Amino acid sequence: KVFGRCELAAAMKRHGLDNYRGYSLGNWVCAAKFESNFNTQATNRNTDGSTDYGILQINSRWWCNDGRTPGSRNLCNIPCSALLSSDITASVNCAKKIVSDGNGMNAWVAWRNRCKGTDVQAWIRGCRL
Ligand SMILES: [Cl-]
Ligand code: NA
Numbered sequence: 867k868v869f870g871r872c873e874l875a876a877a878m879k880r881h882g883l884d885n886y887r888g889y890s891l892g893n894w895v896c897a898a899k900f901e902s903n904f905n906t907q908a909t910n911r912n913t914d915g916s917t918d919y920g921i922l923q924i925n926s927r928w929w930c931n932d933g934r935t936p937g938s939r940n941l942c943n944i945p946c947s948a949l950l951s952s953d954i955t956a957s958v959n960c961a962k963k964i965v966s967d968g969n970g971m972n973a974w975v976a977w978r979n980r981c982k983g984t985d986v987q988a989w990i991r992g993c994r995l
Contacts, residue, residue, distance in 0.1 A: 875895050875989070887962075901923040917934075920951075932946035
């Protein structure tokens with residue numbers, strides 16, 4: 867599923883991401899835009915053989931099981947395919963574990979490079995929340 871900007875913002879807010887660990891909604895929407903272009907089905911392979919999955923590009927190296935990343939962990943305790951669902955619940959719940967691990971949203975390369983330090987409230991502007 868390819869979310870609209872405001873549609874995703876509302877789904878994220880409903881799932882408890884607004885101000886989660888102090889990150890305003892616009893941060894999450896911005897991250898998703900540059901990680902996946904709002905597409906729940908996005909996949910990308912990394913050099914080390916791990917794969918990033920779904921709207922927040924969660925890495926199989928640490929967070930989910932895809933059966934093809936030897937010596938990896940499954941800290942979210944889910945199959946990586948669950949992160950590709952039209953229902954964002956699994957991605958959000960895993961993102962909550964990631965962002966609490968000490969490094970905040972810096973875990974998301976695109977967020978660090980393209981959202982951090984910008985006017986992220988522009989990403990929810992106009993939306994009915
Ligand atoms: Cl933080
Ligand atoms: Na695993």
